[PDB]
Write a protein that binds this ligand. Structure first.
Ligand code: MG
Ligand code: MG
Lengths: 244, 244
């Protein structure tokens, strides 16, 4: 079964994210850099400091859902995801709560720009964030997904309210704008090169070895491929020594 | 074959490290934070600024060796590794060369504290670093492995020469000292919590989802286990949602 082969390929990275001190250190590193950036951030007169944050694998830890997929040879499925969200068992990414709370209590506002669904996933999301200790989780802080997954229009909506976004936090390049949304990894790496100086300053990265736009970035129409095609795409993407 | 099962479990993380812009951004983020830390670093009178750096998966990219293991269902093997090192095809971790060169040209010195072997792996290592554009790769910059893999004694040797180490760079917690060398992941995460404020300041982290002390940290005597035991240890480490 290709589905088992697909989820087994995620095991080592899942162990790293769930179990390693190294992952935790990377999360602390990101949020420590984020505080410094925020502290230094200069905003135009008349504007207020905004911080834009992704949720999944940035502030909220959904790794147990991935663990359930590994244990049950399951592809990603929307109804399964909703059930996870409603299960209200999300954990916090290390450092995220303290950073969020720091911003909101020091002349800033964190906005949660997230592709959790506004219709069916808002309630579980807000419940979890409250439980985990995130302050300022009132309804208006969230820009949840309606139809589109691209985020720039939501960022623009925030700027319309007289905020200047000083920082973007995420685990996916698409958490920083639309430049490479739906693009292959060559283009995505190019964007990173073009913006090298922004990382750990304006664009704050969290690690995610399990899923993301980089996964779709492995091949044209990757997400339209069947499990075998995705497996083939992954294997074809491997850069290998000739052993000589 | 358990060996195939062992290497297939690394595929998704390998795709992420080799192909994603996200990995590249994390590397730039680390080295950008490192420059800031270095710039701000205050050293006691009479001392010179030292930066201590790991090589493998910190400054040097050995991912093609991992790709060769995946393609050939191979465990890690020392002679295979030496052959890789001598192949002189190492790549540079994004941002590492520029950071190294910045330090060495701004009143500092990068020392390479590495478990590449002083006897058999020095030549390939220095050749690659020269080719990749690292400055200051004279013999005395390297503290390569003799017998012991623990690094603190080498850090101490650097401090004996009248350097103060302002920064440590690595992908493994053991790149920061001996506190959790050979320890399980619970202890390793505890160290990270105890030192939360140092990450992205004094301790600079690079991502490695493929291997490390976190892998040994999955179970008591993990590295003494046969391939199946390591597979079992990995699977047992999975934290999973109950699906309800
Ligand atoms: Mg995310
Ligand atoms: Mg290393």
């Amino acid at each position: 079964q290709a589905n088992m082969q697909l989820q087994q390929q995620a095991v080592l990275g899942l162990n790293w994210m769930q179990d390693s001190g190294e992952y935790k250190a990377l999360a602390y590193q990101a949020y420590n850099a984020a505080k410094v950036a925020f502290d230094h951030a200069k905003v135009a007169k008349g504007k207020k400091k905004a911080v834009v944050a992704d949720l999944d694998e940035t502030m909220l830890d959904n790794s147990p859902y991935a663990g359930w997929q590994v244990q049950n040879n399951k592809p990603f499925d929307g109804k399964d995801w909703t059930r996870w969200v409603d299960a209200r068992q999300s954990r916090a990414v290390p450092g995220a709560v303290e950073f969020n709370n720091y911003v909101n209590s020091h002349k800033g506002k964190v906005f949660y720009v997230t592709n959790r669904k506004d219709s069916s996933e808002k309630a579980g999301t807000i419940d979890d964030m409250k439980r985990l200790g995130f302050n300022g989780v009132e309804e208006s802080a969230f820009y949840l997904k309606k139809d589109k997954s691209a985020k720039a229009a939501r960022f623009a909506e925030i700027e319309k309210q007289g905020y200047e976004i000083v920082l973007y936090v995420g685990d996916n390049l698409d958490d920083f704008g639309n430049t490479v949304y739906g693009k292959l990894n060559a283009d995505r790496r190019a964007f990173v090169d073009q913006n090298q100086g922004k990382f750990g300053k304006t664009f704050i990265m969290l690690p995610n070895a399990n899923y993301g736009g980089w996964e779709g970035g492995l091949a044209e129409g990757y997400f339209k491929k069947d499990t075998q095609g995705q497996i083939k795409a992954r294997l074809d993407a491997v850069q290998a020594w000739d052993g000589k």
